[PDB]
Amino acid sequence: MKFSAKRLPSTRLGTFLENRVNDFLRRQNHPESGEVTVRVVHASDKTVEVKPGMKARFVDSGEMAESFPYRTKALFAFEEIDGVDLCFFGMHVQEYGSDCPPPNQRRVYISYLDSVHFFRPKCLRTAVYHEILIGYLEYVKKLGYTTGHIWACPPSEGDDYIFHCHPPDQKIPKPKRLQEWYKKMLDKAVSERIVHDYKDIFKQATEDRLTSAKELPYFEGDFWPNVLEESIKELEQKTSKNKSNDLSQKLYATMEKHKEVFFVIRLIAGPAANSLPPIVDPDPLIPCDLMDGRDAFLTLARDKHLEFSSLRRAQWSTGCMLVELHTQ
Ligand SMILES: Cn1cc(-c2ccc(NC(=O)[C@H](NCCc3ccc(C#N)cc3)c3ccccc3)nc2)cn1
Ligand SMILES: [Cl-]
């Protein structure tokens, strides 16, 4: 096709990921694998606003910024199977640069990732997912991002993060299996000396000596900002007849209850982390309404009856997805 994955415009980030993946596959020399293309298909600037409860408590008193700028990116990976492109992996990320106020400075957060399980061969599928995620971590570490953040959260039964209508036999992993999948990825990144270490959110808070909710990173659509609003509302209902840091107390209790699902990934440790030059992303903005957040691509798939529920339909929906991205 003139409208194929390869023909999408290149980026430094996407070239870096696809090089790392195809290096890995060539080394495996499995006769069923195909070439992998990776493309960034959206990049734009955004802000995340501190919600009303935290704003009244921290923003209005001058203690915390009112909002946090970031860049969002969407990227997708494609394999050649029978000479045709199959989109098999997608990811949306938020990147908070060196200009961003604390506590968000130099952090990346994975918003959503997703897959369609037809990568060939099956036995290298997980490895390839891992290479993409490790590659992203390596890449942002080199720009000078110091910390990665993952919320391990499977989609609900019958729901789709990125790709509309998954195969009926592609199973959603249970939380513990997913948590182990991320640990396996992160142990490999640690052994390649990309990741220095990683910690659950609770342990990390304790080790950073977090004494106020304002010190907690505040991301778009993440669990912690909602938690903080519900906790402030609970606290404000309290009265006491006659004869503080109570938010912090509740945050800690909630962090401990859920610590296993929130990964804090240190990419740059020690004094190296404190003398860094400004983060400069060499890649340009990529406006693309279709891939600005997850919803627009889910809608278009529904409208045009695109489905990722078999090899043939996913190959079909990849082709139409590509048509649409050159087209728009
Ligand atoms: C019939 N039906 C299938 C689904 C369905 C099945 C699978 C998926 N998505 C994934 O498996 C996706 N896969 C991403 C790659 C991946 C593969 C295996 C494991 C494990 N363990 C972790 C990630 C994923 C995203 C976020 C969290 C967990 C999974 N999404 C939806 C919904 N309805
Ligand atoms: Cl996810």
Kind of pairing, strands 262-266 and 107-115?
unpaired
Degrees, nearest 5: CA angle 6-113-192: 80
Tokens of 171: 């199973």
Task: Name the E strands within the chain.
Answer: 36-49, 67-81, 84-96, 107-115, 147-151, 197-200, 262-266
Residue 230: partners with Cβ closer than 8 Å, 6 or more residues away: none
Q: At what angle do helices 246-257 and 223-237 cross, to 10 degrees?
A: 130
- Sign of the Cα pseudo-torsion (73, 129, 294, 297, in order): positive
Pocket-testing residue among 172, 176, 180, ligand 1, by greatest number of atoms within 8 A of Cβ:
172
d(CA 312, CA 300): 18
* 3-state secondary structure at position 277: coil
CA distance 228 to 58: 12
* CA dist., res. 215 & res. 218, Å (int): 9
- The DSSP secondary-structure symbol of 286 reads B
Q: Which two tokens stand for residue 81?
A: 């199977």
212: DSSP letter: S
If you write DSSP's letter for every residue of 85-97 in order, what string do you get?
Answer: EEEEEEEEEEEE-
> Does ligand 1 lie within 6 Å of residue 77's CB atom?
no
> What are the angstrom distances between the C-alpha of 113 and each of 92, 128, 146?
6, 14, 21
Question: What is the token pair recorded at 80?
Answer: 């050649």
Q: Which experimental technique did the depositors report for determining this structure?
A: X-ray
**What DSSP character marks residue 154?**
P
Distance in angstroms (rounded) separating the CA atoms of residues 219 and 216: 10
Which atom of ligand 1 is nearest to 178's Cα? Answer: 21
Ligand 1 binding pocket includes 154 (Cβ within 6 Å): yes
Contact 202, 255 (CB under 8 A): yes
SS3 of residue 24 by DSSP: helix
- Peptide bond before 167: cis, by omega within 30 degrees of 0? no
Flag whether 39 is marked binding.
no
CA of 89 to the centre of ligand 2 (A): 11
**CA 283 to ligand 1 centroid distance, Å:** 29
Segments forming the whole domain that contains residue 213: 1-328
91 DSSP β-pair partners: 75, 113
Longest dimension (CA), the chain: 78
Strand-pair category, 67-81 with 262-266: unpaired
**How many separate domains does the chain show?**
1
Q: After which residues is the chain broken (C to N over 2.5 A)?
A: 243
Residues in the chain: 328
Atom of ligand 1 nearest to the CA of 158: 33
Q: How is 44-76 classified by DSSP, letter by letter?
A: EEEEEEPPHHHIIIIITTTSS-SEEEEEEEEEE
3-state secondary structure of 145: coil
Q: Bridge partners of 221?
A: none
